[PDB]
Structure 1
């Protein structure tokens, strides 16, 4: 029960785990998910770039 995933490039690297605990697993280095509109733009009413902010 292996898992072939991609390597970091600019191939694949097969992986199998041997331990019964998920804590015994390797780090999760390949999660490039992102969402800055929690911090950049946490405003209630939408702010459009091309429009005057205060109208």
Structure 2
């Protein structure tokens, strides 16, 4: 049982893990998740862009 993912472009590729340890697998170079909020905007009260930050 192989897997089949998408390559990087502007097609797919096949992968078969050969080792009993996950540590042996290739890198996870395609995790494109993003969550800036944790850093930019860690305010308790939501700040609405178009509004004044203070009133």
**Offset of 1:46 from its aligned partner?**
0.6
Superposition CA RMSD, Å: 0.4
State how far apart, in whole Å, the 1-side matches of 2:35 and 2:43 are: 15
Question: What is the aligned partner in structure 2 of residue 31 from structure 1?
Answer: 31
TM-score normalised according to structure 2 size: 0.97
Unaligned runs of 5+ in 1: none
Aligned length: 55
TM-score normalised according to structure 1 size: 0.97
State how far apart, in whole Å, the 2-side matches of 1:17 and 1:52 are: 54
Runs of 4+ aligned structure 1 residues displaced above 2 Å come to: none
